[PDB]
Subunit: 261 residues, 4 copies
């Protein structure tokens, strides 16, 4: 995108529709009460909603459908600061819309608080934030590892892997925090029910967890060594042509710094 990338705006639309669908189906399947089979069912719904959407638009935008996941990819230097923000914008509006459309087609009484992420009475906000961190951490770690082109021919469906990771996060987390693992998914129910009690947990946990996962993977487990050069050349895009010059100032690592950053 400094020339004819409709395959940037298609991805933005992907993230928008996938987030609407993700939230619409995730929240919709969470309406009511109950954890025994309630948890299993909601865990599977979110997991399968993600696996479905990652198959649907994973090849088009990477299927982030999650600000925390996009953030993970930003600090991981795999997308530009521009795409990230557009992705999150699309995801936030996408979620709100799905939550909206969900509200419009769902009978009251069943609506409840639209599956608003909520902490368990006996769980402090600090504990809940650590939980949300671990949930998103294993989640992002699974995303990075499975999206990683440098590995496996025995991966199977990465869409399912990621989805089942989300399911795992719910199977464990719902009892604690209803499992947010996704700012956008927590936001949607929040802004429509005018209730931001403890909402900070659902942005901070996933974001930190997402950051730790990106870190844990890229800077330790399976390093994806990138020089500050490429890193910066990533959160800004524009690569690698357009410049002027027949031989062009580009060559010979002679300590002359780098012939411009």
């Amino acid at each position: 995108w400094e020339l004819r990338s409709a395959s940037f705006w298609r991805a933005i639309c992907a993230e928008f529709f996938a987030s609407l669908f993700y939230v619409f189906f995730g929240l919709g399947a969470s309406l009511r009460w109950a954890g025994p089979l309630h948890v299993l069912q909601v865990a599977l719904a979110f997991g399968l909603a993600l696996a479905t959407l990652v198959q649907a638009v994973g090849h088009i935008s990477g299927a982030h459908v999650n600000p925390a996941v996009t953030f993970a990819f930003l600090v991981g230097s795999q997308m530009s600061l521009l795409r990230a923000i557009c992705y999150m914008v699309a995801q936030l509006l996408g979620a709100v819309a799905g939550a909206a459309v969900l509200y419009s087609v769902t009978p009251p009484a069943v609506r409840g608080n639209l599956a608003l992420n909520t902490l368990h009475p006996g769980v402090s906000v600090g504990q809940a934030t650590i939980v949300e961190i671990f949930l998103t951490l294993q989640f992002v770690l699974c995303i990075f590892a499975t999206y990683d082109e440098r590995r496996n021919g025995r991966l199977g469906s990465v869409a399912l892997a990621v989805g089942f990771s989300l399911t795992l996060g719910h199977l464990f987390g719902m009892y604690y925090t209803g499992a947010g693992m996704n700012p956008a998914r927590s936001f949607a129910p929040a802004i429509l029910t005018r209730n931001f009690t403890n909402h900070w947990v659902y942005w901070v946990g996933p974001v930190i967890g997402a950051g730790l996962g990106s870190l844990l993977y890229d800077f330790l487990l399976f390093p994806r060594l990138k020089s500050v050069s490429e890193r910066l050349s990533i959160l800004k895009g524009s690569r690698p042509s357009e410049s002027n010059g027949q031989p062009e100032v580009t060559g010979e690592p002679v300590e002359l710094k780098t012939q411009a950053l």
Copy 2:
């Protein structure tokens, strides 16, 4: 099929048997009452019935086993108007038979209304139609994306993806409309119980949803640009030989229109 395509009639048989099996097992596993674990179980049964059948005959006919899905592929210009109708005919008779055979081997009292798709009292037919649309939309979107030859080597089983998409549709939709997502599957229980109350919902929602999914994908997310030429040459078949002429009137894009449509 203007010469020796038994691999058109084999596919028709595939769609017929798969629809019988699909409906037979889906309806059969839905007999009774209950949603908590009822939903999880029925959602999985349909999902696994589809994943099973898509593995079984997906390579033979594409495993549509769903008029709405076939319709999706028609407006998507991936099959002829002839195949589509034959597919739907096979699917409708296939479903009815499965529902029939199901009735014949199932004890009354347990038969109920043969898992007839039904709306929830607090859900208007308009809301129910929007639900059925979203259900089929994410469903078809998953089918198009996963069937798309232009993508992934990390897809895993597309049969499972599609099946789990169907499961997702049920995990969410059953509470609202019992989740139709398939005219044929709704039809079968309908024509055998002589009850078409709200049946319009189960044809309109999936069909519109299927149409929106085909559109959303082909004309936006991952465009499959086809000229009106090929499009029309698709819903009619007959390609590309038989014509007469040594050099044959075929060549030079000189604005002469197209040397016949």
Copy 3:
């Protein structure tokens, strides 16, 4: 096997251990009462036991672990009459052992009738046999289609496909017949509890269903055309060397019959 096939006896051992494990875990997870979540759990246990075993020994023996499945492969002309019988022998003793070892480590009271396949009071033995036929039919059809080397690169795990097919059979069938789909699995509980009431259903249904699936696939859906020559040369083995002769009586389709069957 008319020279140094330890890779025939390894497969026999595979079928023996897999059947012991299959029955041991399937029956073990079925002990108790309950269908709501009972069915879901037992359906998954068998399905995952199979998917596990098909991954474990599928490359070694094809992981039949089921007389009906082996029978399916026999009439399908994919194995010799010798292997089939040895397979079934291994599977029958394998099952009995697993059921045995299961009994030995399971507390009474919980033992019940060792998950003996049983018909539902309101289900006639004729209806139950048709159910068992459809269960095994979709099952075998999934096995043939997924084992078929002539297809898909988007199959994902065929072990899971097959396993989930088994799960589907249970999700539907357990309420009717407890879902046998496997003579050996029905036999084991039978011979150890000295109860063969309706046992005929559990041999006849799967066998006929297995036969119909093999047929439905090979002689209709995706034909695997084999001349009576190869067919017979299959249920007898011994191919294709050993004969004597420099030019050897083998050649020229001149209607001379076939230079010996």
Copy 4:
């Protein structure tokens, strides 16, 4: 590792974090009571936790996250005595930490005994040990078969296969022993609750089962013939350079023993 293997210490970190996550999520999802849906949920949680972690770090360390599994690979001669011990050390501390972090963020009353593996009153410790053996045996067998580079292109995700094998172990075993299948996972709850009643079962069963699986596979089902030479050269590492000599004492199988072990 007698030169610059950070890709030995990265794997150790992998095993450490994966074990923390594995135990953290497995134990966390097991807190409470109930088996009907309790079992299904806990079986899935562990299974999906493993499938997730095997995707996450399977390409980095083989994702053992289980002393018994590592032991299996040791006697299977696929890792050095050095790696094995470091792996188990990382797994044991990893588990304890996860159990620790779990305790710190979980409300009391819900903490119980931190999902300590426990035998069923009517199950003798001898029976329980045989159960744990079969659980780990089918588990390890699935791991060996699916990790085996010498097979399948239809494997799908080996991470899911392995995970579902673990789920199967739980679906069956939880009623008997709560299903340990992993010393580290049993240890963590044990050392933090100061309760080692019957703990011997949870080391002995998996270890023996793991040993039998490694054996059953490597020395029978699909032999991986290795000469005592390579075997020993494996549990010690250091291969194959560093030696001195232009032609070097290496060659001609003339019965001279082997030119040094």
